[PDB]
Write a protein that binds this ligand. Structure first.
Ligand code: HEM
Length: 154
């Protein structure tokens, strides 16, 4: 799949808002993920003891993790589809060290979309949401392809 320039512009316009508070958006997204799909929490040795939303909000390590994750994702989005080199180390650690199934990348995609919809309604109407969905689908398809090359394709 291929996004048009106009679709990329919608994606990077709302992402520019996210980047005004990377740490805050990172927290909301991981809390949404962990609350909606608790099984995902089990993949994180560092966080799986966290029992409540309050504990998650107070965790300094989870906040730092969320910043690392959104920073990596933002670098990929700003490539506008030319992201082969960025995806390679990411695919390798998630396939063979962390062991993250493609299904869980769909779950975090839904969490990102929910949080942008809640925080940026004026910059995230239906066309912008359609464009971000397409960007994230592109990301997932290209990581699934690398997963297969690396021997996991989980
Ligand atoms: C937008 C999707 C994602 C991005 C951009 C992303 C990015 C990252 C980055 C950059 C790191 C640190 C370096 C590394 O180990 O490669 C990381 C670590 C990790 N990722 Fe993700 N990731 C994503 C989705 C997920 C999902 C959905 C899960 C699990 C449900 C996951 C589980 C992990 C784990 C277990 C670590 C190690 C954390 C630690 O103990 O320090 N990732 N991820």
């Amino acid at each position: 799949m291929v996004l048009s320039e106009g679709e990329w512009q919608l994606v990077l316009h709302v992402w520019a808002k996210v980047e005004a508070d990377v740490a805050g958006h990172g927290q909301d997204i991981f809390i949404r993920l962990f609350k909606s799909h608790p099984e995902t929490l089990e993949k994180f040795d560092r966080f799986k003891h966290l029992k409540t939303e309050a504990e998650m909000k107070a965790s300094e390590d989870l906040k730092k993790h969320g910043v690392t994750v959104l920073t990596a994702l933002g670098a990929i989005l700003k490539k506008k589809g030319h992201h082969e080199a960025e995806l390679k180390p990411l695919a390798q650690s998630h396939a063979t060290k962390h062991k993250i199934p493609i299904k869980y990348l769909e779950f975090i995609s839904e969490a990102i979309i929910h949080v942008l919809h809640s925080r940026h309604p004026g910059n995230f109407g239906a066309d912008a949401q359609g464009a971000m969905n397409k960007a994230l689908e592109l990301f997932r398809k290209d990581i699934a392809a690398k997963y297969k090359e690396l021997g996991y394709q989980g």
